[PDB]
Amino acid sequence: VGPPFELVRDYCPVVESHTGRTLDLRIIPRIDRGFDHIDEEWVGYKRNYFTLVSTFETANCDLDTFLKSSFDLLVEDSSVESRLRVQYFAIKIKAKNDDDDTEINLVQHTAKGPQFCPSVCPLVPSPLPKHQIIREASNVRNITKTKKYDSTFYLHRNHVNYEEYGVDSLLFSYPEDSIQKVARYERVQFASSISVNKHFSLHVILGAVVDPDTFNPGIPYDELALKNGSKGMFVYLQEMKTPPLIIRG
């Protein structure tokens, strides 16, 4: 189903703040629409949308554990081993011009009115729904208000007994109550380039959002807007990509 992904790099190690154990992190991507497999190669078309869905899993940790515990980012520059408290995990989407080896812009639509840059999606570990389910959901509005899909795509913090958690539980750090279990980017396309068959590449990045008002370290990270409207950090953790995609007219 769609172009395959491969691991690019594992960046910053994440450790359960209490035990010091590394958290096993695994990005589970999948393009559910947009490319054709033409003789040992994947083909896309500039004037065609594509769907990229993804989730991540924690090999050595179940959901409940993930929500009750705390996690730190091991920041070991040269000598001192500091620690950045993770506020929440999230996935970001990106494209790349494989010929130039530089980054390309991605854009999304809805019908085709307003155009916007894809967003950073907060997530919670989870199995990636099969291609069918994804497609179905692509036609279900207000998934949250649906017994059928809700549980599969979201987690409602406001539905859990707060008494069974701790003041520093990861759960209370997430942006909002409605937390996605699967990032869903549909009607996505490569941004209109300046008047140039190119070779593009799609990437999925897993990051830890840290709020600097709790301690900058020199490590791979993107500037992010915190709900509290201030400078936040999206620190890479893992990254996967697709083989060079052939896009034509």
Tracing tokens 């003041």 back to the chain, one arrives at: 167
Under 8 Å between Cβ of 224 and 16:
no
Please choose, from the candidates 122, 3, 117, the residue with its C-alpha nearest in 3D space to the C-alpha of residue 51: 3
Q: CA-to-CA distance for 189 and 127, rounded, in angstroms?
A: 25
Q: How many Å apart are CA 68 and CA 62, to the nearest integer?
A: 10
Q: d(Cα 31, Cα 145) in Å, to the nearest integer?
A: 26
**CATH number, domain containing residue 118:** 2.60.40.1390
For 206, the domain range is: 1-249
CA distances from 218 to 16, 107, 171, 182 (A): 21, 29, 27, 30
Place of tokens 């520093």: 168
No. of H helices and E strands in the chain?
A: 3, 19
* Residue 27, beta-bridge partner list: 56
Give buried/exposed letters for 83-120 (b at 16+ CB in 10 A, else e): bbbbbbbbbbbbbbbbeeeeebebebeeeeeeeeebeb
What's 194's DSSP letter?
S
Q: Provide φ and ψ at 212, rounded to 5°.
A: -45, -20
Burial class of residue 207 in the structure, from the number of CB atoms within 10 Å of its CB (0-12 exposed, 13-18 middle, 19+ buried): buried
* Residue pair 218/77 in contact by the 8 Å Cβ criterion: yes
Residue 115 to residues 2, 49, 109, 111, 184, Cα–Cα distance (Å) = 24, 13, 5, 11, 16
How many other β-carbons are positioned within 10 Å of the β-carbon of residue 126?
A: 20
**What is the number of structural domains in the chain?**
1
